[PDB]
Amino acid sequence: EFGDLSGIISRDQFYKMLKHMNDNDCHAVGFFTYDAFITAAKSFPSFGNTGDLAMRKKEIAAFFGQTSHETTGGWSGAPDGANTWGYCYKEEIDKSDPHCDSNNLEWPCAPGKFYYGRGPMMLSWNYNYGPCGRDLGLELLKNPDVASSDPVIAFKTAIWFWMTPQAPKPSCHDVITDQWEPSAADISAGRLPGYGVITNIINGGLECAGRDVAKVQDRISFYTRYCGMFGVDPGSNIDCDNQRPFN
Ligand SMILES: [Cl-]
Ligand SMILES: [Cl-]
Ligand SMILES: [Cl-]
Ligand SMILES: [Cl-]
Ligand SMILES: [Cl-]
Ligand SMILES: [Cl-]
Ligand SMILES: [Cl-]
Ligand SMILES: [Cl-]
Ligand SMILES: [Cl-]
Ligand SMILES: [Cl-]
Ligand SMILES: [Cl-]
Ligand SMILES: [Cl-]
């Protein structure tokens, strides 16, 4: 059963965290399931299985904090608070942009396919769908919409993103599990290990260094709620308002 996370996160906890995603007011009702999450996680053994018990729970809280924001349907004064509205969407609302970078040569854009955000991490662009597909043994470049029709695949794309360094960025996994050693240049950029660097990895060019404080605070609000629920310390350097984005 190693790699099965059901011993440290229960259905009760999963659906309490995501208490509105199955509400009629959300847009992917019944799509994201606890079983789909557990199955996806088995494909990435070290996810949720690195460190002591508290570290394992912290990683789960961080992953759900970030993916909850990517998928949020929250608003100011939402029932039970905006930090209860994660997983309200399974794909990007605006589907008009193919997100094709034709200058990349390894991952050709398939005709008529769109690489807009899908899944918990809102995976985007041919240059992410390509290597993700390669790594999962799936044809995601040719069939990107499987990432929004199969919940196991949807979660796998999100965990893949979480586990995968993309130079110069380390993996989110490495940051949250105290396995990332910042370079002297990272230190000069204010990028000290914590949830803040994770926000920076995901969308720092548009949100960090004070560029979108509201979005960053939303990411923090989910994470702190989830940490409180698991009873774990969220760690230091939770914000990224004094970090420079990665280059
Ligand atoms: Cl259960
Ligand atoms: Cl419904
Ligand atoms: Cl792994
Ligand atoms: Cl295994
Ligand atoms: Cl373990
Ligand atoms: Cl938003
Ligand atoms: Cl809504
Ligand atoms: Cl609120
Ligand atoms: Cl949706
Ligand atoms: Cl498509
Ligand atoms: Cl520090
Ligand atoms: Cl937001």
PDB file of C-alpha atoms and ligand atoms in Angstrom:
ATOM      1  CA  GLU A   1       0.000   0.000   0.000  1.00  0.00           C
ATOM      2  CA  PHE A   2       3.025   2.325  -0.097  1.00  0.00           C
ATOM      3  CA  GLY A   3       2.082   5.396  -2.137  1.00  0.00           C
ATOM      4  CA  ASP A   4      -1.574   5.112  -1.203  1.00  0.00           C
ATOM      5  CA  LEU A   5      -2.389   8.339   0.671  1.00  0.00           C
ATOM      6  CA  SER A   6      -5.682   7.126   2.151  1.00  0.00           C
ATOM      7  CA  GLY A   7      -4.036   6.621   5.555  1.00  0.00           C
ATOM      8  CA  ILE A   8      -3.303  10.350   5.943  1.00  0.00           C
ATOM      9  CA  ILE A   9      -6.163  11.972   4.017  1.00  0.00           C
ATOM     10  CA  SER A  10      -9.713  10.618   4.326  1.00  0.00           C
ATOM     11  CA  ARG A  11     -12.806  11.222   2.167  1.00  0.00           C
ATOM     12  CA  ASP A  12     -14.225  13.207   5.098  1.00  0.00           C
ATOM     13  CA  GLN A  13     -11.182  15.513   4.968  1.00  0.00           C
ATOM     14  CA  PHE A  14     -11.058  15.711   1.153  1.00  0.00           C
ATOM     15  CA  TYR A  15     -14.731  16.723   0.847  1.00  0.00           C
ATOM     16  CA  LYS A  16     -14.551  19.054   3.838  1.00  0.00           C
ATOM     17  CA  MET A  17     -11.650  20.892   2.187  1.00  0.00           C
ATOM     18  CA  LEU A  18     -13.538  20.936  -1.115  1.00  0.00           C
ATOM     19  CA  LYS A  19     -16.956  21.459   0.422  1.00  0.00           C
ATOM     20  CA  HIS A  20     -18.473  23.433  -2.476  1.00  0.00           C
ATOM     21  CA  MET A  21     -17.056  21.713  -5.540  1.00  0.00           C
ATOM     22  CA  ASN A  22     -20.094  19.447  -5.769  1.00  0.00           C
ATOM     23  CA  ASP A  23     -22.524  22.368  -5.294  1.00  0.00           C
ATOM     24  CA  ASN A  24     -24.897  23.172  -8.125  1.00  0.00           C
ATOM     25  CA  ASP A  25     -23.220  26.604  -8.300  1.00  0.00           C
ATOM     26  CA  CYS A  26     -19.922  25.038  -9.405  1.00  0.00           C
ATOM     27  CA  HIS A  27     -18.970  23.892 -12.903  1.00  0.00           C
ATOM     28  CA  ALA A  28     -17.290  20.492 -12.553  1.00  0.00           C
ATOM     29  CA  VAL A  29     -19.769  18.798 -10.199  1.00  0.00           C
ATOM     30  CA  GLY A  30     -18.765  15.216  -9.457  1.00  0.00           C
ATOM     31  CA  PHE A  31     -15.716  15.351 -11.716  1.00  0.00           C
ATOM     32  CA  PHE A  32     -12.905  15.481  -9.178  1.00  0.00           C
ATOM     33  CA  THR A  33     -13.234  12.534  -6.851  1.00  0.00           C
ATOM     34  CA  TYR A  34     -11.309  11.285  -3.875  1.00  0.00           C
ATOM     35  CA  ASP A  35     -10.687   7.941  -5.653  1.00  0.00           C
ATOM     36  CA  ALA A  36      -9.276   9.753  -8.698  1.00  0.00           C
ATOM     37  CA  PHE A  37      -6.839  11.692  -6.468  1.00  0.00           C
ATOM     38  CA  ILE A  38      -5.680   8.564  -4.619  1.00  0.00           C
ATOM     39  CA  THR A  39      -5.174   6.657  -7.901  1.00  0.00           C
ATOM     40  CA  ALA A  40      -3.255   9.537  -9.491  1.00  0.00           C
ATOM     41  CA  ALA A  41      -1.005   9.837  -6.419  1.00  0.00           C
ATOM     42  CA  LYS A  42       0.007   6.154  -6.665  1.00  0.00           C
ATOM     43  CA  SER A  43       1.758   7.063  -9.960  1.00  0.00           C
ATOM     44  CA  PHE A  44       4.055   9.444  -8.064  1.00  0.00           C
ATOM     45  CA  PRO A  45       5.135   7.448  -4.986  1.00  0.00           C
ATOM     46  CA  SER A  46       7.296  10.195  -3.357  1.00  0.00           C
ATOM     47  CA  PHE A  47       4.378  12.670  -3.441  1.00  0.00           C
ATOM     48  CA  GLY A  48       2.866  12.667   0.058  1.00  0.00           C
ATOM     49  CA  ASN A  49       5.463  10.066   1.153  1.00  0.00           C
ATOM     50  CA  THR A  50       8.525  12.235   1.700  1.00  0.00           C
ATOM     51  CA  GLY A  51       9.540  13.134   5.240  1.00  0.00           C
ATOM     52  CA  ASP A  52       7.826  12.496   8.546  1.00  0.00           C
ATOM     53  CA  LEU A  53       4.079  12.455   9.048  1.00  0.00           C
ATOM     54  CA  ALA A  54       3.816  16.242   9.388  1.00  0.00           C
ATOM     55  CA  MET A  55       5.842  16.822   6.204  1.00  0.00           C
ATOM     56  CA  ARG A  56       3.616  14.419   4.244  1.00  0.00           C
ATOM     57  CA  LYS A  57       0.501  16.295   5.386  1.00  0.00           C
ATOM     58  CA  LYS A  58       2.130  19.662   4.684  1.00  0.00           C
ATOM     59  CA  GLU A  59       2.832  18.604   1.111  1.00  0.00           C
ATOM     60  CA  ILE A  60      -0.785  17.559   0.614  1.00  0.00           C
ATOM     61  CA  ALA A  61      -1.967  20.880   2.134  1.00  0.00           C
ATOM     62  CA  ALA A  62       0.379  22.841  -0.177  1.00  0.00           C
ATOM     63  CA  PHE A  63      -0.756  20.932  -3.263  1.00  0.00           C
ATOM     64  CA  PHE A  64      -4.420  21.453  -2.456  1.00  0.00           C
ATOM     65  CA  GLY A  65      -3.802  25.094  -1.530  1.00  0.00           C
ATOM     66  CA  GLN A  66      -2.308  25.916  -4.902  1.00  0.00           C
ATOM     67  CA  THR A  67      -4.678  23.779  -7.007  1.00  0.00           C
ATOM     68  CA  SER A  68      -7.699  25.117  -5.097  1.00  0.00           C
ATOM     69  CA  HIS A  69      -6.720  28.634  -6.179  1.00  0.00           C
ATOM     70  CA  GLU A  70      -6.138  27.577  -9.801  1.00  0.00           C
ATOM     71  CA  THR A  71      -9.682  26.130  -9.861  1.00  0.00           C
ATOM     72  CA  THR A  72     -11.484  28.464  -7.450  1.00  0.00           C
ATOM     73  CA  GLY A  73     -15.083  29.639  -7.842  1.00  0.00           C
ATOM     74  CA  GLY A  74     -14.849  31.792  -4.726  1.00  0.00           C
ATOM     75  CA  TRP A  75     -15.940  35.391  -4.256  1.00  0.00           C
ATOM     76  CA  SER A  76     -15.923  38.003  -1.489  1.00  0.00           C
ATOM     77  CA  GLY A  77     -18.484  36.835   1.100  1.00  0.00           C
ATOM     78  CA  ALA A  78     -19.019  33.407  -0.466  1.00  0.00           C
ATOM     79  CA  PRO A  79     -20.799  30.791   1.721  1.00  0.00           C
ATOM     80  CA  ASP A  80     -18.351  29.582   4.403  1.00  0.00           C
ATOM     81  CA  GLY A  81     -15.661  31.902   2.995  1.00  0.00           C
ATOM     82  CA  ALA A  82     -13.873  32.119  -0.371  1.00  0.00           C
ATOM     83  CA  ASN A  83     -11.289  29.614   0.922  1.00  0.00           C
ATOM     84  CA  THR A  84     -13.896  26.830   0.708  1.00  0.00           C
ATOM     85  CA  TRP A  85     -14.535  27.218  -3.053  1.00  0.00           C
ATOM     86  CA  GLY A  86     -11.620  25.242  -4.552  1.00  0.00           C
ATOM     87  CA  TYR A  87     -12.178  22.840  -7.496  1.00  0.00           C
ATOM     88  CA  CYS A  88     -15.187  24.719  -8.865  1.00  0.00           C
ATOM     89  CA  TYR A  89     -13.730  24.572 -12.421  1.00  0.00           C
ATOM     90  CA  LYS A  90     -11.886  21.771 -14.251  1.00  0.00           C
ATOM     91  CA  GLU A  91     -10.618  23.892 -17.166  1.00  0.00           C
ATOM     92  CA  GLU A  92      -9.917  27.468 -18.233  1.00  0.00           C
ATOM     93  CA  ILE A  93     -13.021  29.618 -18.834  1.00  0.00           C
ATOM     94  CA  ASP A  94     -11.624  31.328 -21.928  1.00  0.00           C
ATOM     95  CA  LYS A  95     -10.972  28.560 -24.476  1.00  0.00           C
ATOM     96  CA  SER A  96     -10.167  30.783 -27.486  1.00  0.00           C
ATOM     97  CA  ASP A  97      -6.323  30.699 -27.227  1.00  0.00           C
ATOM     98  CA  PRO A  98      -4.598  27.484 -28.427  1.00  0.00           C
ATOM     99  CA  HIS A  99      -1.552  28.245 -26.237  1.00  0.00           C
ATOM    100  CA  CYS A 100       0.843  27.123 -28.955  1.00  0.00           C
ATOM    101  CA  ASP A 101       4.506  28.091 -28.871  1.00  0.00           C
ATOM    102  CA  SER A 102       5.618  27.038 -32.354  1.00  0.00           C
ATOM    103  CA  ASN A 103       9.233  28.043 -31.607  1.00  0.00           C
ATOM    104  CA  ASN A 104       9.548  24.983 -29.388  1.00  0.00           C
ATOM    105  CA  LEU A 105      10.574  22.102 -31.684  1.00  0.00           C
ATOM    106  CA  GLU A 106      10.194  18.960 -29.580  1.00  0.00           C
ATOM    107  CA  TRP A 107       6.435  19.374 -28.957  1.00  0.00           C
ATOM    108  CA  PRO A 108       4.523  20.215 -32.161  1.00  0.00           C
ATOM    109  CA  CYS A 109       1.020  21.695 -31.804  1.00  0.00           C
ATOM    110  CA  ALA A 110      -1.575  19.272 -33.236  1.00  0.00           C
ATOM    111  CA  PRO A 111      -4.002  20.875 -35.723  1.00  0.00           C
ATOM    112  CA  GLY A 112      -7.219  22.095 -34.111  1.00  0.00           C
ATOM    113  CA  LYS A 113      -6.131  21.246 -30.581  1.00  0.00           C
ATOM    114  CA  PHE A 114      -6.019  23.766 -27.751  1.00  0.00           C
ATOM    115  CA  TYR A 115      -3.577  23.739 -24.815  1.00  0.00           C
ATOM    116  CA  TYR A 116      -5.478  26.097 -22.519  1.00  0.00           C
ATOM    117  CA  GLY A 117      -5.528  25.290 -18.805  1.00  0.00           C
ATOM    118  CA  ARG A 118      -6.942  21.954 -17.710  1.00  0.00           C
ATOM    119  CA  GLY A 119      -7.023  20.040 -14.434  1.00  0.00           C
ATOM    120  CA  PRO A 120      -6.173  21.049 -10.844  1.00  0.00           C
ATOM    121  CA  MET A 121      -2.985  22.839 -11.901  1.00  0.00           C
ATOM    122  CA  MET A 122      -4.512  24.344 -15.057  1.00  0.00           C
ATOM    123  CA  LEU A 123      -1.713  22.800 -17.145  1.00  0.00           C
ATOM    124  CA  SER A 124      -1.179  24.968 -20.225  1.00  0.00           C
ATOM    125  CA  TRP A 125       0.863  25.131 -23.483  1.00  0.00           C
ATOM    126  CA  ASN A 126       2.172  22.527 -25.937  1.00  0.00           C
ATOM    127  CA  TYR A 127       5.528  22.611 -24.088  1.00  0.00           C
ATOM    128  CA  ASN A 128       3.824  21.262 -20.946  1.00  0.00           C
ATOM    129  CA  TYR A 129       1.295  18.873 -22.513  1.00  0.00           C
ATOM    130  CA  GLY A 130       4.152  17.360 -24.571  1.00  0.00           C
ATOM    131  CA  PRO A 131       6.561  16.313 -21.801  1.00  0.00           C
ATOM    132  CA  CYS A 132       3.667  15.523 -19.464  1.00  0.00           C
ATOM    133  CA  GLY A 133       2.215  13.121 -22.058  1.00  0.00           C
ATOM    134  CA  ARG A 134       5.660  11.556 -22.589  1.00  0.00           C
ATOM    135  CA  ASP A 135       6.077  11.044 -18.855  1.00  0.00           C
ATOM    136  CA  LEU A 136       2.591   9.619 -18.245  1.00  0.00           C
ATOM    137  CA  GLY A 137       2.578   7.469 -21.401  1.00  0.00           C
ATOM    138  CA  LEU A 138      -0.371   9.392 -22.854  1.00  0.00           C
ATOM    139  CA  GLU A 139      -0.927  11.199 -26.164  1.00  0.00           C
ATOM    140  CA  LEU A 140      -1.725  14.592 -24.605  1.00  0.00           C
ATOM    141  CA  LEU A 141      -0.345  16.656 -27.474  1.00  0.00           C
ATOM    142  CA  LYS A 142      -2.681  14.938 -29.937  1.00  0.00           C
ATOM    143  CA  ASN A 143      -5.557  14.594 -27.435  1.00  0.00           C
ATOM    144  CA  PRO A 144      -5.258  17.325 -24.799  1.00  0.00           C
ATOM    145  CA  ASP A 145      -8.925  17.184 -23.812  1.00  0.00           C
ATOM    146  CA  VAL A 146      -8.449  13.860 -22.021  1.00  0.00           C
ATOM    147  CA  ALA A 147      -7.001  16.026 -19.219  1.00  0.00           C
ATOM    148  CA  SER A 148     -10.515  17.408 -18.651  1.00  0.00           C
ATOM    149  CA  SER A 149     -12.599  14.281 -19.334  1.00  0.00           C
ATOM    150  CA  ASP A 150     -10.755  11.722 -17.185  1.00  0.00           C
ATOM    151  CA  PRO A 151     -10.320  12.760 -13.520  1.00  0.00           C
ATOM    152  CA  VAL A 152      -7.408  10.368 -12.915  1.00  0.00           C
ATOM    153  CA  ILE A 153      -5.556  11.897 -15.865  1.00  0.00           C
ATOM    154  CA  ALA A 154      -6.556  15.393 -14.630  1.00  0.00           C
ATOM    155  CA  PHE A 155      -4.983  14.719 -11.216  1.00  0.00           C
ATOM    156  CA  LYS A 156      -1.932  13.042 -12.824  1.00  0.00           C
ATOM    157  CA  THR A 157      -1.205  16.170 -14.858  1.00  0.00           C
ATOM    158  CA  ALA A 158      -1.327  18.279 -11.683  1.00  0.00           C
ATOM    159  CA  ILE A 159       0.919  15.948  -9.651  1.00  0.00           C
ATOM    160  CA  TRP A 160       3.275  15.669 -12.637  1.00  0.00           C
ATOM    161  CA  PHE A 161       3.584  19.472 -12.667  1.00  0.00           C
ATOM    162  CA  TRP A 162       4.153  19.484  -8.884  1.00  0.00           C
ATOM    163  CA  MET A 163       6.916  16.860  -9.106  1.00  0.00           C
ATOM    164  CA  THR A 164       8.716  18.220 -12.171  1.00  0.00           C
ATOM    165  CA  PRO A 165      11.540  20.777 -12.102  1.00  0.00           C
ATOM    166  CA  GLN A 166      11.712  23.051 -15.123  1.00  0.00           C
ATOM    167  CA  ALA A 167      15.072  24.849 -15.159  1.00  0.00           C
ATOM    168  CA  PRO A 168      15.631  27.394 -13.650  1.00  0.00           C
ATOM    169  CA  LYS A 169      12.678  26.475 -11.383  1.00  0.00           C
ATOM    170  CA  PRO A 170      12.964  23.588  -8.927  1.00  0.00           C
ATOM    171  CA  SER A 171       9.944  21.302  -8.382  1.00  0.00           C
ATOM    172  CA  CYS A 172       7.216  22.369  -5.972  1.00  0.00           C
ATOM    173  CA  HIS A 173       7.787  18.961  -4.336  1.00  0.00           C
ATOM    174  CA  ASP A 174      11.426  19.764  -3.636  1.00  0.00           C
ATOM    175  CA  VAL A 175      10.599  23.146  -2.082  1.00  0.00           C
ATOM    176  CA  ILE A 176       7.864  21.830   0.237  1.00  0.00           C
ATOM    177  CA  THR A 177       9.908  18.809   1.385  1.00  0.00           C
ATOM    178  CA  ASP A 178      13.020  20.847   2.326  1.00  0.00           C
ATOM    179  CA  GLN A 179      15.044  19.325  -0.534  1.00  0.00           C
ATOM    180  CA  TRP A 180      15.689  22.506  -2.508  1.00  0.00           C
ATOM    181  CA  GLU A 181      18.944  24.362  -1.910  1.00  0.00           C
ATOM    182  CA  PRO A 182      18.611  27.909  -3.251  1.00  0.00           C
ATOM    183  CA  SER A 183      21.516  29.164  -5.342  1.00  0.00           C
ATOM    184  CA  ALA A 184      23.215  32.394  -4.361  1.00  0.00           C
ATOM    185  CA  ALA A 185      21.200  34.009  -7.201  1.00  0.00           C
ATOM    186  CA  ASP A 186      17.934  32.652  -5.739  1.00  0.00           C
ATOM    187  CA  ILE A 187      18.879  34.182  -2.367  1.00  0.00           C
ATOM    188  CA  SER A 188      19.605  37.529  -4.027  1.00  0.00           C
ATOM    189  CA  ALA A 189      16.121  37.358  -5.588  1.00  0.00           C
ATOM    190  CA  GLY A 190      14.577  36.860  -2.140  1.00  0.00           C
ATOM    191  CA  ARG A 191      13.508  33.310  -3.002  1.00  0.00           C
ATOM    192  CA  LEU A 192      13.824  31.588   0.356  1.00  0.00           C
ATOM    193  CA  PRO A 193      12.235  28.113   0.667  1.00  0.00           C
ATOM    194  CA  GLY A 194       8.508  28.128   1.441  1.00  0.00           C
ATOM    195  CA  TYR A 195       5.008  28.391  -0.004  1.00  0.00           C
ATOM    196  CA  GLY A 196       5.964  31.770  -1.498  1.00  0.00           C
ATOM    197  CA  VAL A 197       8.558  30.217  -3.873  1.00  0.00           C
ATOM    198  CA  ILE A 198       5.884  27.664  -4.856  1.00  0.00           C
ATOM    199  CA  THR A 199       3.542  30.524  -5.858  1.00  0.00           C
ATOM    200  CA  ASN A 200       6.536  31.976  -7.733  1.00  0.00           C
ATOM    201  CA  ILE A 201       7.113  28.662  -9.581  1.00  0.00           C
ATOM    202  CA  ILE A 202       3.447  28.486 -10.615  1.00  0.00           C
ATOM    203  CA  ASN A 203       2.769  32.097 -11.672  1.00  0.00           C
ATOM    204  CA  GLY A 204       5.380  34.452 -10.232  1.00  0.00           C
ATOM    205  CA  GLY A 205       5.826  36.611 -13.342  1.00  0.00           C
ATOM    206  CA  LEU A 206       2.215  37.763 -12.967  1.00  0.00           C
ATOM    207  CA  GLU A 207       1.648  37.656  -9.186  1.00  0.00           C
ATOM    208  CA  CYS A 208       4.854  37.948  -7.144  1.00  0.00           C
ATOM    209  CA  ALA A 209       6.912  41.027  -6.259  1.00  0.00           C
ATOM    210  CA  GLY A 210       3.587  42.784  -5.523  1.00  0.00           C
ATOM    211  CA  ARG A 211       2.210  42.302  -9.060  1.00  0.00           C
ATOM    212  CA  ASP A 212      -1.097  40.727  -7.922  1.00  0.00           C
ATOM    213  CA  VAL A 213      -1.406  40.696  -4.128  1.00  0.00           C
ATOM    214  CA  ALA A 214      -5.051  39.532  -4.152  1.00  0.00           C
ATOM    215  CA  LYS A 215      -4.257  36.383  -6.127  1.00  0.00           C
ATOM    216  CA  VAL A 216      -1.297  35.541  -3.896  1.00  0.00           C
ATOM    217  CA  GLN A 217      -3.389  36.054  -0.750  1.00  0.00           C
ATOM    218  CA  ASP A 218      -6.072  33.696  -2.115  1.00  0.00           C
ATOM    219  CA  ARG A 219      -3.415  30.981  -2.558  1.00  0.00           C
ATOM    220  CA  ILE A 220      -2.284  31.609   1.015  1.00  0.00           C
ATOM    221  CA  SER A 221      -5.827  31.572   2.424  1.00  0.00           C
ATOM    222  CA  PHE A 222      -6.525  28.067   1.072  1.00  0.00           C
ATOM    223  CA  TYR A 223      -3.120  26.770   2.252  1.00  0.00           C
ATOM    224  CA  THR A 224      -3.469  28.108   5.796  1.00  0.00           C
ATOM    225  CA  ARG A 225      -6.997  26.630   6.087  1.00  0.00           C
ATOM    226  CA  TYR A 226      -5.776  23.239   4.910  1.00  0.00           C
ATOM    227  CA  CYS A 227      -2.733  23.312   7.222  1.00  0.00           C
ATOM    228  CA  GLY A 228      -5.038  24.088  10.158  1.00  0.00           C
ATOM    229  CA  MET A 229      -7.263  21.163   9.191  1.00  0.00           C
ATOM    230  CA  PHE A 230      -4.291  18.737   9.066  1.00  0.00           C
ATOM    231  CA  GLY A 231      -2.739  20.375  12.139  1.00  0.00           C
ATOM    232  CA  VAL A 232       0.595  21.184  10.508  1.00  0.00           C
ATOM    233  CA  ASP A 233       2.923  24.198  10.551  1.00  0.00           C
ATOM    234  CA  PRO A 234       2.678  26.079   7.206  1.00  0.00           C
ATOM    235  CA  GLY A 235       6.375  27.005   7.445  1.00  0.00           C
ATOM    236  CA  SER A 236       8.205  30.263   6.718  1.00  0.00           C
ATOM    237  CA  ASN A 237       8.311  32.558   3.682  1.00  0.00           C
ATOM    238  CA  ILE A 238       4.646  31.965   2.844  1.00  0.00           C
ATOM    239  CA  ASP A 239       4.245  35.106   0.700  1.00  0.00           C
ATOM    240  CA  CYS A 240       6.175  36.246  -2.397  1.00  0.00           C
ATOM    241  CA  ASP A 241       5.686  40.014  -2.352  1.00  0.00           C
ATOM    242  CA  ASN A 242       9.448  40.476  -1.778  1.00  0.00           C
ATOM    243  CA  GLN A 243      10.633  37.819  -4.239  1.00  0.00           C
ATOM    244  CA  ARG A 244      11.696  38.462  -7.811  1.00  0.00           C
ATOM    245  CA  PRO A 245      10.064  36.141 -10.389  1.00  0.00           C
ATOM    246  CA  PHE A 246      12.166  33.340 -11.886  1.00  0.00           C
ATOM    247  CA  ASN A 247      13.839  34.016 -15.257  1.00  0.00           C
TER     248      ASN A 247
HETATM  249 CL    CL B   1     -12.704   7.455   3.718  1.00  0.00          CL
HETATM  250 CL    CL B   2     -25.730  19.717  -9.433  1.00  0.00          CL
HETATM  251 CL    CL B   3       7.896   9.755  -7.306  1.00  0.00          CL
HETATM  252 CL    CL B   4       5.670   2.070  -6.795  1.00  0.00          CL
HETATM  253 CL    CL B   5       5.932   7.387   3.850  1.00  0.00          CL
HETATM  254 CL    CL B   6      -9.156  33.790  -9.423  1.00  0.00          CL
HETATM  255 CL    CL B   7     -19.682  31.031  -9.964  1.00  0.00          CL
HETATM  256 CL    CL B   8     -14.900  35.567   1.837  1.00  0.00          CL
HETATM  257 CL    CL B   9     -15.135  23.842 -15.909  1.00  0.00          CL
HETATM  258 CL    CL B  10      -8.703  20.647 -27.813  1.00  0.00          CL
HETATM  259 CL    CL B  11      14.481  31.170   5.757  1.00  0.00          CL
HETATM  260 CL    CL B  12      -8.242  35.139  -6.598  1.00  0.00          CL
END
